[PDB]
Design an enzyme around this catalytic site. Sequence first.
Site, PDB file in Angstrom:
ATOM      1  CG  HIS B  41       9.835  -6.622   5.869  1.00 14.48           C
ATOM      2  ND1 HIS B  41       9.397  -7.762   5.224  1.00 14.48           N
ATOM      3  CD2 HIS B  41       8.972  -6.323   6.864  1.00 14.48           C
ATOM      4  CE1 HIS B  41       8.313  -8.154   5.878  1.00 14.48           C
ATOM      5  NE2 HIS B  41       8.026  -7.332   6.883  1.00 14.48           N
ATOM      6  N   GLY B 143       2.127  -7.663  11.260  1.00 12.29           N
ATOM      7  CA  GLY B 143       2.799  -8.388  12.326  1.00 12.29           C
ATOM      8  C   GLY B 143       2.942  -9.880  12.066  1.00 12.29           C
ATOM      9  CB  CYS B 145       6.218 -10.219   8.293  1.00 15.55           C
ATOM     10  SG  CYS B 145       5.135  -9.265   7.203  1.00 15.55           S
TER      11      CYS B 145
HETATM   12  C1  N8X Z   1       4.820  -1.376   3.370  1.00 16.53           C
HETATM   13  C2  N8X Z   1       5.214  -2.832   3.315  1.00 16.53           C
HETATM   14  C3  N8X Z   1       5.896  -3.347   2.220  1.00 16.53           C
HETATM   15  C4  N8X Z   1       6.261  -4.685   2.144  1.00 16.53           C
HETATM   16  C5  N8X Z   1       6.943  -5.235   0.919  1.00 16.53           C
HETATM   17  C6  N8X Z   1       5.931  -5.516   3.204  1.00 16.53           C
HETATM   18  C7  N8X Z   1       5.211  -5.048   4.295  1.00 16.53           C
HETATM   19  C8  N8X Z   1       4.649  -6.017   5.309  1.00 16.53           C
HETATM   20  C9  N8X Z   1       3.279  -6.499   4.874  1.00 16.53           C
HETATM   21  O1  N8X Z   1       2.789  -6.169   3.796  1.00 16.53           O
HETATM   22  N1  N8X Z   1       2.734  -7.468   5.668  1.00 16.53           N
HETATM   23  C10 N8X Z   1       1.532  -8.127   5.761  1.00 16.53           C
HETATM   24  N2  N8X Z   1       1.384  -9.431   5.923  1.00 16.53           N
HETATM   25  N3  N8X Z   1       0.042  -9.737   5.743  1.00 16.53           N
HETATM   26  C11 N8X Z   1      -0.585  -8.625   5.494  1.00 16.53           C
HETATM   27  N4  N8X Z   1       0.270  -7.595   5.496  1.00 16.53           N
HETATM   28  C12 N8X Z   1      -0.103  -6.191   5.340  1.00 16.53           C
HETATM   29  C13 N8X Z   1       4.881  -3.699   4.346  1.00 16.53           C
END
Ligand code: N8X
Lengths: 304, 304
Positions: B41, B143, B145
């Site tokens: 992603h 961030g 990820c």
């Molecule tokens: C819109 C969207 C959709 C997907 C499937 C993934 C992401 C990254 C994410 O959620 N990252 C993150 N890691 N910890 C807390 N958060 C918010 C964003």
Amino acid sequence: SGFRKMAFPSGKVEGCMVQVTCGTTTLNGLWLDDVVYCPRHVICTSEDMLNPNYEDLLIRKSNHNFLVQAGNVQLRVIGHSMQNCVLKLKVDTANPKTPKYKFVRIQPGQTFSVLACYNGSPSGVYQCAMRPNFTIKGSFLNGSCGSVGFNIDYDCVSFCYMHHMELPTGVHAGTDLEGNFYGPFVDRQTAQAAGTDTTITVNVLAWLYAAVINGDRWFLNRFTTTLNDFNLVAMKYNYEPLTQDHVDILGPLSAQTGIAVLDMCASLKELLQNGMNGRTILGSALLEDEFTPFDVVRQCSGVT
Amino acid sequence: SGFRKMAFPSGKVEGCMVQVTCGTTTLNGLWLDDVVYCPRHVICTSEDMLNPNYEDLLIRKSNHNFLVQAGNVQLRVIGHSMQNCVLKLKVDTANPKTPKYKFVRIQPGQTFSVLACYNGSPSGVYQCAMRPNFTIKGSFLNGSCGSVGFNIDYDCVSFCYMHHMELPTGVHAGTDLEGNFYGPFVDRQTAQAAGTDTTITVNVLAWLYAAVINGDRWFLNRFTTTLNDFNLVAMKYNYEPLTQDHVDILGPLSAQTGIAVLDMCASLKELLQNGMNGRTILGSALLEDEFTPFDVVRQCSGVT
Ligand SMILES: Cc1cc(C)cc(CC(=O)Nc2nncn2C)c1
Ligand SMILES: Cc1cc(C)cc(CC(=O)Nc2nncn2C)c1
């Protein structure tokens, strides 16, 4: 989101751990520049530990009696001196992996990461707090002595703790990096009273703010309190009295969440008087006091 | 003595973290040998994440669009490929800090350490469990990820997890290092049901053995039970059914303490039916399931 008992990344400290052996005792040392720091009880046998005369025991030792090994390579000891309860072994080689560092004496209620080590090798890392009574509740077995506690500000490691002993009660005692014990403890196998401990009120409040930020809000109520009223409750439940300095440090969390510190104190008051009623806050069924307001801000903002 | 939620020393993993940027998205990558692994992603904008066609999005990208920085030095990307939900960026330089490593797919109920990172920089380390429903309850902000989960056996790092997303419920989902999600999750911003979770029974029993070893014994009783009787209680309280494989893995702890596994099951049964009565076990007011029998043995023996 989510909130965990997070330790600092231990890499910079792992590069400083060495094994120190003197006679039949092996423990851990901290190699920074051309000096290895370790607990002075490395010169004792378990027989000596009942009432050791460290000055006399150290006089029978020469530089060649301190065996210092960094991984698999041997360090040449060119000097030795005792500073309080630590030995400083001057070696002929500066640690190439020495990070930017400071020696600091933390205050009771402050937190730090511990890198537990055995025979100079790292076993694991965990976050803990220096209790108000200057003990720590760690995980330390025989051979863990010399493992250190630290904090990291960007590239600088502030070493605050060196492990020395386990009290008969199973709690842990140690020194700053100048060899000064935290608390009234002595490096002797004797009955040692750790004082009455209390819960770190400012940390519990910081953790309640972390809970609200991360979605756990069931404990918020329609009440407020005063510092005086709250402290009467804190007294009854063996909590540290909250001061205006503590309220001021909670400022950023109060501003971020929009929940006045005395309003959060009223929630804490109700939780102390009524308990959790079988509910949890951030995965815990008790009031957590091992996160400082700084830790909460750091974790909630992703500081590296 | 003492028992802590200990993470592995993170140094070997810290030396592998890099920052990967593609367009306007920045996240973390894992640099092992001449390959950087990161969540696919990274090629999406938040707009794309509602329903991304990764194959089409990746076709618009060239090697020069993936900006990989290891600390302050730039890596030259000479290849890119998508494997499941991960991108593999071939670089022209092998990571000098690549430890001995393996890619493993852990089982639900197993534990691992997570090195949370932002912009390729480590922020902290914590131990967690892969839930029976294949989610993890971590601490991850925007961030994070690309941050990875791992275990370490002496000098070998087994990477088991790469972080990809937070579900609308606040729990975390990710993949093994071949890009295969744990659980039914997809890397898309959509409603995603995490299945019914349960408590990891074998881990709670392992933790009760750790409590006995470390002096917390108040929960031991005069009763025993059978696997069938215990499993009727485990069913009622949303605990995983205990199997003979689980009893066998508890063997060493049963032998060390002299407490038969079914006797410890009877203690767990009484704790489930009666609660803690305001008491604690190893500093916790709930039944802890994030320590495997292997973790308990390791921590209780000081494995480095
Ligand atoms: C819109 C969207 C959709 C997907 C499937 C993934 C992401 C990254 C994410 O959620 N990252 C993150 N890691 N910890 C807390 N958060 C918010 C964003
Ligand atoms: C007899 C004796 C006396 C003192 C003052 C110190 C020691 C080392 C020690 O207690 N180390 C240790 N660290 N964690 C757990 N344990 C047992 C030994």
